[PDB]
Amino acid sequence: HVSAEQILRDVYKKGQDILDLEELREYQRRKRTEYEGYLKRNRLDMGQWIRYAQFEIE
RNA sequence: GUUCGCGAAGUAACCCUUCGUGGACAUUUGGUCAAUUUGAAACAAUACAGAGAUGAUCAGCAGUUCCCCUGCAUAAGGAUGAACCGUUUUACAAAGAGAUUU
Numbered sequence: 626h627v628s629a630e631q632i633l634r635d636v637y638k639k640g641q642d643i644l645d646l647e648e649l650r651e652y653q654r655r656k657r658t659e660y661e662g663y664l665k666r667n668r669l670d671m672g673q674w675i676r677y678a679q680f681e682i683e
Numbered sequence: 684g685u686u687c688g689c690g691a692a693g694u695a696a697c698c699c700u701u702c703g704u705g706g707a708c709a710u711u712u713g714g715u716c717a718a719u720u721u722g723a724a725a726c727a728a729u730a731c732a733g734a735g736a737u738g739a740u741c742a743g744c745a746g747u748u749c750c751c752c753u754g755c756a757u758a759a760g761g762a763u764g765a766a767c768c769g770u771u772u773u774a775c776a777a778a779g780a781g782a783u784u785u
Contacts, residue, residue, distance in 0.1 A: 659769070659770080660770090661749085662748095662766075662767090662769090663767090663769070663770085665747085665748055665749060665766095666747050666748055666766075666767060667747070667748095667767085668747085668748095672771070673770090673771090676770080676771070676772095
């Protein structure tokens with residue numbers, strides 16, 4: 626009962642707040658540095674532009 | 684200051700000197716810049732780790748960059764020079780069926 630589906634199923638099974646305004650400013654700094662880093666290296670993933678703009682809508 | 688012209692004194696002196704006068708020669712530099720912190724160099728000092736493929740040990744060459752450094756450099760080197768991996772929802776429909784409000 627050592628069939629390959631059991632091994633691959635178990636290797637799938639093995640693989641698994643804001644308070645103040647300046648804290649939200651640091652949150653926006655961290656998140657905009659993240660998304661401008663992943664838009665500076667790749668300017669052609671349009672989903673990334675979409676979700677960073679939708680972040681700044683949020 | 685030098686020279687040219689004139690006058691006045693020494694001085695009833697064409698020698699010389701002094702004083703006064705008009706002219707000419709000569710005509711607008713340097714600073715983007717102030718002498719220790721407070722208009723910005725970076726390394727080094729501490730401490731810890733100690734390299735990209737994966738089971739280990741590695742040669743690399745590349746690409747993107749709103750990262751540069753050493754290099755005379757368009758060569759070459761810098762860990763393959765470094766960051767790359769991270770999140771991840773709508774150009775969004777059409778057909779068919781039943782359960783609901785009127």
